[PDB]
Design an enzyme around this catalytic site. Structure first.
Site, mmCIF file in Angstrom:
data_model
loop_
_atom_site.group_PDB
_atom_site.id
_atom_site.type_symbol
_atom_site.label_atom_id
_atom_site.label_comp_id
_atom_site.label_asym_id
_atom_site.label_seq_id
_atom_site.Cartn_x
_atom_site.Cartn_y
_atom_site.Cartn_z
ATOM 1 N N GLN A 102 0.927 -1.214 0.148
ATOM 2 C CA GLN A 102 -0.187 0.520 -0.178
ATOM 3 C C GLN A 102 0.626 1.348 0.052
ATOM 4 O O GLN A 102 0.640 2.374 -0.479
ATOM 5 C CB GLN A 102 -1.044 0.390 1.099
ATOM 6 C CG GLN A 102 -1.631 0.913 0.891
ATOM 7 C CD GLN A 102 -2.965 1.041 2.451
ATOM 8 O OE1 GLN A 102 -3.787 0.436 2.134
ATOM 9 N NE2 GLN A 102 -2.761 1.882 3.446
ATOM 10 N N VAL B 51 -1.683 5.882 12.684
ATOM 11 C CA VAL B 51 -2.468 4.679 12.107
ATOM 12 C C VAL B 51 -1.718 5.194 10.299
ATOM 13 O O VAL B 51 -1.865 6.147 9.562
ATOM 14 C CB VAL B 51 -3.872 4.269 11.855
ATOM 15 C CG1 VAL B 51 -3.619 3.607 13.184
ATOM 16 C CG2 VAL B 51 -4.698 5.793 12.177
ATOM 17 N N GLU B 52 -1.265 3.932 9.872
ATOM 18 C CA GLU B 52 -1.130 3.672 8.291
ATOM 19 C C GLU B 52 -2.413 4.624 7.335
ATOM 20 O O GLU B 52 -1.221 4.878 6.047
ATOM 21 C CB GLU B 52 -0.974 2.729 8.052
ATOM 22 C CG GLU B 52 -2.713 1.523 7.523
ATOM 23 C CD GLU B 52 -2.366 0.380 7.101
ATOM 24 O OE1 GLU B 52 -1.533 -0.652 8.270
ATOM 25 O OE2 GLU B 52 -3.399 -0.075 5.921
ATOM 26 N N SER B 53 -2.988 5.466 7.691
ATOM 27 C CA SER B 53 -3.729 6.050 6.086
ATOM 28 C C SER B 53 -3.514 7.836 6.993
ATOM 29 O O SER B 53 -4.098 8.555 6.798
ATOM 30 C CB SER B 53 -5.118 5.879 6.600
ATOM 31 O OG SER B 53 -5.672 5.975 8.037
#
Ligand SMILES: [Cu+2]
Lengths: 317, 260, 317, 260, 317, 260, 260
Positions: A102, B51-53
């Site tokens: 991602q 967090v990854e976002s």
């Protein structure tokens, strides 16, 4: 202005063959109204990078509208762990698909917005993400819109003995994103995180913006600090209230969990799936019909509670 | 909120006992998020969840369902673009800040912590297809990790079907030769029967501790490869004051923790 | 908390022979107050990418603190078209310097923040930027805060025949930025354009933030959409009202032209320059002395008028 | 306001007359800025000004002295990071949007439009050191440009000391030979005497027109190389309405247009 | 526009023997800057309802400018519990004064704004407020800016037997208020409590507004929900940053305790008082002199911290 | 924080113990304020503070020195014009809401609760001139009140010099005889020695209790009139928890409670 | 937007020609609002419109339908409570500001401008019932007015059915004796056939001017009482530049002005 109906806009700027990019993150700010018209229009043979994909790419895949799909993650996070049409078609051998981490996908889009020749990263190495190609060089060569090479190991020009993974920067034909406010000239305001939204509206040749509301140009400039995209990068502005439904949309409404649950079970089979699509997509003339089908109070009870940012029933507080 | 703790609560508490104070913690949703929320609240108040976002320094009220939820977004210190997050984990390595700890999951794992969460079977024609990598690969390439795993014999394989997240690869020296940062790797494996660690000098997995509800043999019996269980100690049941917290303050709606 | 005095911030994080980065863009939100302290402290042998510089870098150079400079532009645009001390010091052969475009400077820092192993760009070819190195390879082999190579030419792994310019990425030591609001835990808010400020804060090993105001960790989080850098990235918050003077600060104050003109003519000669630095820097104990020396009504009259965003005299409107 | 227009005014109105409705105009401050302003306000109301700091679609009230000036910032449609401006101009090309027109300037200019803005004389020990590239290098690599110069023989040379911003190089195929985007380059050159263009087949500069104040000869006396002044036409004097305008609205403070 | 200098505002609208009204409440948003100018100008024989007064009315009285005072309360609450000059001047029998409750003072002005022929209240009975008049009817027959009767008792036309206290309504000459923002046409914005400020502005024949900032008629109208008085009611806007010092101003600055303490002890004697007024009022040419005399860092440190609404030293938090 | 409580602390805690959950409390600054704060924060979390400036439902962080203090203003539920406060208290009565309890104070007090806050000696040529009525006149006319006084014989007299705030007048029917609302009046009087109440049948004040520090006699030696100290009970000393509180949270700056 | 003006436009223009610059104008919706909007825009730019619901200094975009519309509310200088508006008209009288002009309507009117808008017939058992007074009574008690009326013989009665808005009552001296402010009264009557005025010394109505489309006899024939038409002059048709304005800028939706 660039104000046009969602039918007209989609027809003009989206075409089969296209390498598209959809905004939003999983169940947060996905361009659903639009994804409906793409399907409803028989648009097909699309390629694209999924990003943090949700029901949006699932619907396209299951409806067989994807030639090649560049993947990092696909799940209606929370409700569906691993999208069903997605894992079924891939498991069936009916979908052409590549897997990238991602991180690399969000980078790829970023490097595109930036104008980089290509993207060198010290990621994906020593992982099966480099040891395995989803789309082989052989199949890639016969495909329009897909790089002939997934990646290429190259030396680091300044750190001898060391090599990095070079990745092709994608060329996005159309970018579709959903925002809270936009002007007739294309100036776009996205409250909260933007995800890949600004990158893909800078990269894409054509950009379509579905928005909750439209404000005058004079108005949206009153405070330049809140604008995220200049009119220049935007081609079609479409008024589409709750256009992200069933996904969240910061400061406006929360995800529609019952709905996402219906879809979770419905998509477990192509039959249930197609049946679902005929009712919600193909049978409805336009987005208004979708809103009305849902009903007034249903939409109202999804609204965000100031201070919380999400929906809580305050009458029980 | 009493003394009838669930297996997930045992895990979520054990996770939370590993978060030192002030360190940065990368998590998703699920048990690691519960554990982070519990340490954040009691064991290590000034640890920071990311967090990854791209959502920086999180402090959720109602627990989030996905790492891009408004449940996180509206309750964080900084809302950054995804790219800056990847920029962050890498720089931490470059800065040698040595304060980051991360959580990853998966379907299979091997003696050296290499994890698979992409597919079961042939990657080209897989028996079972998962979502894929997500940010797991970045995390395992540049961060010290804690791996969340089911303790089934069919998950603890001598060799996995695909390495979406790289562990210690093959033992000492393995990572660097594949061009992976050498001083960052799998720190601990937390399953439903206890915690497993990796030898400091051989990088091979060994049983560190087992839950009250389990034993070393239970562990051995549900592991596809041999283990050194002879060094394991029994962890203690969760402090009841904490179980009350998890049930009343943390997850009243039982989204990740269901009561008996 | 990370709240500390300027003297302490600088002394602890900033050292001689350090690769530094200063936020701001020419005459906009430059961290002047911090520059003065670095000077009084006698910090020397500073090497750093100038970025779109002005008075701040001019003063470090003129005071002979810069061991290696990486230029792209240096001026107080509108007043002094070329930083007089910068040009004199270079022409006289005292300033070791390199030239990249401004595009490649900003892309360099950002690539640093993003963690790329190097930056590949298709800019700077067919020009003096690649033809001539301001710092030779033989000189570069002695400078420890500078790469051995100004850049390299490499092939595009995905477009044979085409060659790209691979630039080395900066390993920044300390970043010093000036924001409108920060909080005891590091969380910073920069109103308006961040320029390179967030990239450097993220990339730097140590970052220091001087701010117009300190608010509480709880107040700054009430609307996380106004924040720009998480506190894990800031090491020291320093309260310094008007600490960017004479450069503007969005939402607060405009630039002090009168003070910029003085510096303009004063810097024409090292004699006057050193005199100026004695009165305003070395003779002043701190930032409060500086503020009082300027005067109450002075600063008040710099104030940004709501609606314009810059200062004007409404009593004449 | 009246019949006594200045040279700078002549240049500004001439610049404004080159802007087209709908095009994206890259500017800085000074005459180009005064040029874009007058166009925006008069000749081409819907053209979109953009500066190299990252301030997109600008519409200043009082004239900015810098590109990061709050006078631009508080009056634009969107504030983008510096890097997104580079990416925008590159993408504009990649899309073949063909609408971007950027203004530049320098100390010297050769027959092919190449411009120097870095230093005069030996680069490593210059006679005159200037600011340096700025973003003009980037603008030159990817945008059709209108160069601004002072009409002085020492400026218009055959071989400039340093090429900061690439033009047509040496002639047809040159840009390509050097690796620069081929379908983009110097389009016009505006100076205090007239406008010079570049030959379609040889890319060598020639006089395309001259102000009411000049003559093809004066241009010659001031160009340090051979010019084809055989096609030159005489432009008309500025219209009072536009002079009134520039003076009383665009720059009443005479920041740039210092009126008599 | 109505924008004018303080000297001119005062000289034109404020006259000797005028019934004035000063906005503010004790140590909160009192129009000090205007008081100083009235003093320098030697304006005398001022009669006015004090309202919940403090330093402002104390200083007029101590300087012997008040011909008739209508008290209800006078102090710099928290510092000087009783305005020393007010009490001394009254006890010595120099100050002609009346007493109503604070309730009846505020109700008096408001009844004036509303246009009632008189104010009927069922307050003040069975107390010294009705038993004793501070200004007798014989004295009142000489005071032209005071009603002949302190009040009257009248029957409730709708509740026989019950008698109500009919108070006379004030015919205010000039109202001087201090607001945070006003505009060239009069439109004023008072952030926080208006106290009696809007009533007096509406009721007064002439009203003068000193303000911290002047914005444009167009900007002030963009959100009419932040406005408090229409411009048809204001006669003069006067720019006076910190013109309420040492009293607080909501949203901007807190009270200057140190300056309030000085006035506290200094006013204990007329000797010191007159000395104080010479240095801070009569020796100063204007409000800018006053500001500069105070000092840059002085004023800066009065600043309201977002989240608290009052000042504190965040560098200790 | 410890065992050495001050007289003022004794009065504050005693005041706090008079507040009831759900009632509207009219206050100013000083001990009453410290009283309401301690109640709100400890004894009656949901009582609603209101001041005469118009700031309704207050909850200060740092103690206000005035009633219009930004310390109240920035921390209340609603900012009303002064006049609406008068109207509120009047309406409270008219509705017979019976919940309002207001605090007042003065220079002198007579056996029926009448209080003087205007001046001592001949009103027209006073010995000591004070501020004046304030809004205490209004509060006295329509609210049940708790009067604060210093226990001095010269303060507790038989006939006060001026009646600023009406109490029970002369006895049963007096308030009515004077035109004041009859079912409302002095309820308690707190001073530095004890709490005095008013007889139900005669409305004449009598000692209801005395602090651990005082005795019924001391009270007598300091009251300039005859007191029935036969029903008086001794109150307990303040609880450390509340002293710690007052000192370290309600008034660490010692604005009012100047600690030893 | 040409030369085919409607009767309403003739009226709305004639109204607008009466608004001097800088004066305060009280209006509702309907023709007076149109007229105010037109003067505001051309004849008297700095006049100020105020409406009875407390909306101060109005400048509508789309014309409002009711005097409390968001069409007004969102486009005014100050949103005051109704009471302050009444406070305003009265004070203007007390201040002798002499700059206010107001519009009222009605069903019947008499020689002295007394107007009825409450009911036709017996007020207790009326033939026709209207809304009633509204703010008309305050306006006619304290303001100089302009009365909007239909020119029907049955509306111009020698004596009306009810005086909801008091004019000059019965002639000279009438108002003051009824206790009404004497120097404020009916200034002008504007009907669909012209404008009528009241004698300065007798207060009785006389024809001042008639529209092009009317004549003095037309006027006489539709008036229930005698008039002095012999002094009337013909007004001029509306300047076409204005009719364009009314149709394009002011009321494009034809809410009050319908085109032919
Ligand atoms: Cu097609």
């Amino acid at each position: 202005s660039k104000v046009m109906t969602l039918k007209d806009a989609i027809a003009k700027y989206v075409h089969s063959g296209d390498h598209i990019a959809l905004g939003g993150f999983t169940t947060d700010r996905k361009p659903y109204a639009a994804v409906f018209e793409i399907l409803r229009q028989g648009i097909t043979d699309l390629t694209g990078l999924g990003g943090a994909a949700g029901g949006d790419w699932d619907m396209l895949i299951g409806n067989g509208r994807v030639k090649a799909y560049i993947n990092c993650y696909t799940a209606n996070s929370g409700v569906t762990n691993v999208s069903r049409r997605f894992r079924k078609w891939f498991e069936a051998g009916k979908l052409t698909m590549e897997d990238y981490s991602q991180d690399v996908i969000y980078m790829m889009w970023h490097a595109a917005a930036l104008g980089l020749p290509f993207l060198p990263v010290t990621l994906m190495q020593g992982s099966g993400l480099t040891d395995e190609w989803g789309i082989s060089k052989e199949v890639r060569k016969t495909l329009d819109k897909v790089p002939d090479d997934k990646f290429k190991y190259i030396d680091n020009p300044f750190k001898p003995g060391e090599k990095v993974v070079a990745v092709p920067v994608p060329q996005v034909d159309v970018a579709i994103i959903h925002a809270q406010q936009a002007s007739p000239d294309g100036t776009v305001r996205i409250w909260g995180g933007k995800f890949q939204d600004v990158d893909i509206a800078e990269a894409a040749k054509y950009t379509i913006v579905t928005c909750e509301e439209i404000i005058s140009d004079e108005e949206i400039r009153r405070d330049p600090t809140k604008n995220d995209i200049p009119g220049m990068c935007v081609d079609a502005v479409v008024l589409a209230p709750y256009g992200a439904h069933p996904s969240q949309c910061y400061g406006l409404y929360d995800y529609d969990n019952p709905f996402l649950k219906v879809y979770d079970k419905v998509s477990k089979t192509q039959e249930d799936f197609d049946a679902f699509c005929k009712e919600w997509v193909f049978d409805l003339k336009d987005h208004d019909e979708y809103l009305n089908k849902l009903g007034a109070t249903r939409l109202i009870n999804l609204k965000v509670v100031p201070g919380l940012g999400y929906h809580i029933d305050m009458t029980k507080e | 909120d009493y003394t009838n703790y669930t297996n997930k609560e045992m895990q979520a508490v054990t996770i939370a006992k590993q978060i030192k104070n002030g360190q940065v913690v990368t998590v998703g949703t699920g048990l690691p998020l519960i554990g982070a929320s519990v340490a954040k609240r009691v064991y290590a108040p000034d640890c920071h969840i990311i967090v990854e976002s791209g959502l920086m320094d999180c402090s959720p009220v109602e627990v989030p369902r996905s790492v891009g939820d408004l449940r996180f977004m509206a309750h964080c210190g900084c809302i950054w673009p995804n790219v800056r997050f990847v920029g962050f984990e890498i720089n931490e390595y470059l800065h040698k800040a040595n304060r980051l700890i991360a959580f990853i999951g998966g379907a299979q794992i091997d003696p050296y912590g290499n994890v698979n969460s992409t597919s079961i079977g042939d990657y080209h024609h897989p028996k079972t297809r998962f979502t894929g990598s997500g940010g797991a690969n970045g995390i395992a390439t540049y961060s010290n990790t804690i791996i969340m795993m089911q303790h089934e014999k069919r998950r603890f394989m001598n060799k996995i079907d695909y390495v979406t997240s790289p562990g210690w690869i093959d033992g000492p020296g393995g990572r660097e030769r594949l061009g992976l940062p050498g001083d960052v790797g799998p720190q601990l494996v937390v399953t439903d029967k206890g915690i497993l660690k990796f030898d400091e000098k051989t990088k091979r997995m060994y049983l560190a501790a087992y839950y009250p509800t389990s034993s070393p043999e239970d562990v051995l019996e549900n592991t596809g490869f041999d283990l050194d269980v002879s060094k394991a100690v029994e962890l203690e049941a969760p402090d009841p004051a904490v179980i009350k917290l998890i049930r009343e303050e943390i997850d009243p709606g039982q989204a990740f923790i269901q009561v008996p």
